[PDB]
From a paper:
Virus ΦcrAss001 (Kehishuvirus primarius) was the first representative of this order to be isolated in pure culture from human faecal samples. Here, we present the characterization of ΦcrAss001 using cryo-electron microscopy (cryo-EM), enabling de novo structure building and elucidation of functions for around 1,440 protein subunits constituting the virion, leading to the identification of a novel ‘crass fold’ in the distal part of the tail. The virion possesses a short non-contractile tail extending approximately 44 nm from an icosahedral capsid. The extended tail barrel formed by widely conserved paralogous ring proteins has a high capacity for storage of cargo proteins alongside the capsid cargo zone, ensuring that the proteins required for the initial stages of crassvirus infection are carried inside virions and delivered to the host cell.
The portal protein’s clip domain interacts with the tail barrel, which extends approximately 23 nm towards the muzzle protein complex at the tip of the tail. The barrel was reconstructed by imposing C12 symmetry to a resolution of 3.20 Å, and with C6 symmetry to a resolution of 3.30 Å. The barrel is composed of five stacked dodecameric ‘rings’, termed ring 1 (R1, at the portal end) to ring 5 (R5, at the muzzle end). These structures are formed by four paralogous ring proteins: R1, R2 and R3 are encoded by genes gp43, gp40 and gp35, respectively, whereas R4 and R5 are both encoded by gp34. In R5 (gp34), residues 15–26 adopt 2 conformations—5a and 5b—that facilitate binding to the 6-fold symmetric muzzle complex. The tail barrel and fibre docking hubs are stabilized by disulfide bonds, notably between fibre docking hub proteins, the fibre docking hub and ring proteins, and between R1 and R2. Unexpectedly, well-defined density at the inner surface of R1 and R2 of the tail barrel corresponds to 12 copies of an additional α-helical segment of the same protein, gp45 (residues 214–245). At the end of the tail is a large hexameric assembly of the muzzle protein gp44. A further region of density inside the tail was observed at its distal end, next to the ring-joining domain of the muzzle protein. This region corresponds to 6 copies of a 14-residue segment containing an α-helix.
Numbering used by the authors:
A (entry chain U), B (entry chain E), C (entry chain U), D (entry chain F): 1 to 238
The structure:
């Protein structure tokens, strides 16, 4: 549903049918609300407890198709460009892609075969390094985030005498903003996420209606403007 | 029932009987609300938790006959047109049809016979690639969504020394919009999902009354225009 | 109860006894409401959870007599007229009758005797085709809906080395509309479901009173016209 | 109406339908009364509470056409010639146009961007200068009037770290006098506002009737000589 339709049905659902019509929204306001609804819906549908169904990323066909056009596969770049201080003497630092929203699968290709990366918590790190062995299980590797600047930097811990060749990350791409019109203006160029040009919703058309409905709900909550509406609809930011 | 009957009965149910009759809706507004109701009804009826009966796609004769006119069978196109970075070294990339709404059944015909595709979750992917074997069961194949642009791209994982001949996908076709009248205008051509011409409801007449009722409910909720109505009737967008 | 009486007692129950009489309804409005009530009552009484009793199609004598004058027996036409792509290499495509509302019994007459058709779900299809045999039980056959255009197209899967001779479907016919008067007019011919002429209620007279009562309830809900009435009586569309 | 029409038609209204029945006004007196009447009309139709409709400058199409030929756009000139003392540390003194009657819109073009000027009262200045930050909002600038000599001088308090490059003022131009004859011909050195020659009305013809009627009322009151009439029609002088 290209952005002109986003604006047109936004008007239709917002004010064109209201009994006491509210002032129509500017295109910047509609773009901001649509982008906010996009992020809110993505976070709602990624986590099962964020929506009424209780279903997450791959808990039904609908969720799979929802995040289908947002999934991306990239590689981590070895961070030997500059020195650094790792928390572990035996961890190799890798930089994840910049346009990363959420990681759902990671894998490392070593000389000793491919191994699934298990992101270990700070409590599991302390528990596991109190043990005599302190290495992953046969077909897995460990991961902990390290000092990150401008992008997520990642420490990979593999078994001894293993060299990493590739480090693939299957992640959810950061959604691009929904901008209806060229936001360029003589009085000042405004941006949604650093882009002023027209930006289509690059997700599957299945959730475009949900994004529009959430945008309308946010618009009406802003219209009322009391604390109750803001807190009630702010619970779904998540 | 054809588009004329949708519009006429929409007027009848909306404002021709109500005491303090409200302004009649424009045909663009009626078409918008009918299309939104169509998508909402489809999403409610696919998921058991989305409707009051607790019944999903195939949980009763009515639910079968509801989507009977929306089911379609196609084939995935092998994505060797251009190079790409697969998350799994032994996965063949396939492109699904553009007009895909939900996948309900997939199957792949290999040299070793037909094999049912099981869409494995990311947590199930991590669990399964931690085992020594890392291959599907005898009569199945595995599947994960990969980098998708403009249409869903799919990674198929089969057993070793197996070649894929075809990849059939039983999916639900994307519903076409319901447009009452030719939306062509001298002041600007407006579209619902990229089409301005008249578009009939391409689903079974069993749910035409259902779509009309949902459209009327959405129309009256928009008429009320308060945050309450939008929030409570957005719960059914799903 | 022929349609003149439908209109006369509709008036009597709607406005002729009211203290502050509402405007009388047009014959088109009454026809639309009666047809809507007809479909709503059929769907109420087919599914047990749709009515207060909790009784479905054949759960009491009343329901049997209710759907008695709506049941029909027809045959499926082999769809070798044109080529197609079946989801199963070994399924024969058959086209169901056009005036089909709900299927309650299906059967196929093969050279190896008659067999009851079991409509298998998309989950049962995946479960059953993961098994070594992948054929029906002795005296049954499987069924899944395929690409359908203008009428439900059906795939029949029988055991190997079995040829289908007949395919009988015992279904519930689509109800004809209730039209009181010839809706032909000089200002434009209106239709309920594509027919303008007088149309009697072709169901058993047992549910005519229920259809009239539901029509009156819909009329009064439309008269009030608030969102509450529309949503409350829209739950019974089902 | 040319000046000759204002004089001739004053006598169809003041002088008892040009009957020489009322006292008889010279052309200098008629010019004086017309000038006073136009000033009164401008002041009354500007303030909503000053007229009979409760409508101000831009509150109806008639008011928009009334002041259409007075609205002027002019730039302010930096008052760097005189090194006076400003009440605010970061105030740049600007001189306004000499033919200024009422200001209605002011804007300042800074290096950061254009900023709408808010004419801030002496109470709001003390209120907003009792706070931590003490700067305008991101899209506005303040303005207070300062030591003025035979002109209008305004302090532009724009946010620190910003420089003013322009200052546009949209205002109501001071109306020119209405004079119906060369005053020097018969009256020695009398001027209305410094002009001794024929001066036409610089206003839209829509309010010429209003101005003439007000002049007639003022003449009749000034000649009836009652204190009550003078004080009663003195109410509308503002």
């Amino acid at each position: 549903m290209n952005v002109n339709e986003f604006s047109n049905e936004f008007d239709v659902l917002y004010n064109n049918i209201m009994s006491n019509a509210a002032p129509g929204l500017n295109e910047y306001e509609k773009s901001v609300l649509l982008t906010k609804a996009q992020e809110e819906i993505v976070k709602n549908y990624f986590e099962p407890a964020g929506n009424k169904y209780g279903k997450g990323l791959d808990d039904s066909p609908k969720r799979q198709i929802d995040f289908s056009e947002l999934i991306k596969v990239g590689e981590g770049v070895l961070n030997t460009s500059a020195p650094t201080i790792t928390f572990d003497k035996r961890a190799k630092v890798y930089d994840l892609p910049a346009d990363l929203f959420l990681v759902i699968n990671e894998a490392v290709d070593t000389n000793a075969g491919t191994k699934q990366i298990v992101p270990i918590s700070y409590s599991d790190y302390t528990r596991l390094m109190s043990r005599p062995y302190k290495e992953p299980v046969k077909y897995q590797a460990w991961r902990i985030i390290t000092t990150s600047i401008n992008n997520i930097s990642v420490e990979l811990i593999v078994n001894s005498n293993e060299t990493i060749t590739d480090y693939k990350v299957r992640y959810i791409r950061r959604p691009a903003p929904i901008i209806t019109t060229n936001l360029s203006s003589e009085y000042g160029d405004v941006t949604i996420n650093g882009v002023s040009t027209v930006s289509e919703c690059e997700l599957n058309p299945i959730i475009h209606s949900e994004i529009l409905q959430r945008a309308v709900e946010l618009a009406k909550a802003a219209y009322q403007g009391d604390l109750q509406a803001s807190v009630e609809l702010g619970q779904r930011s998540e």
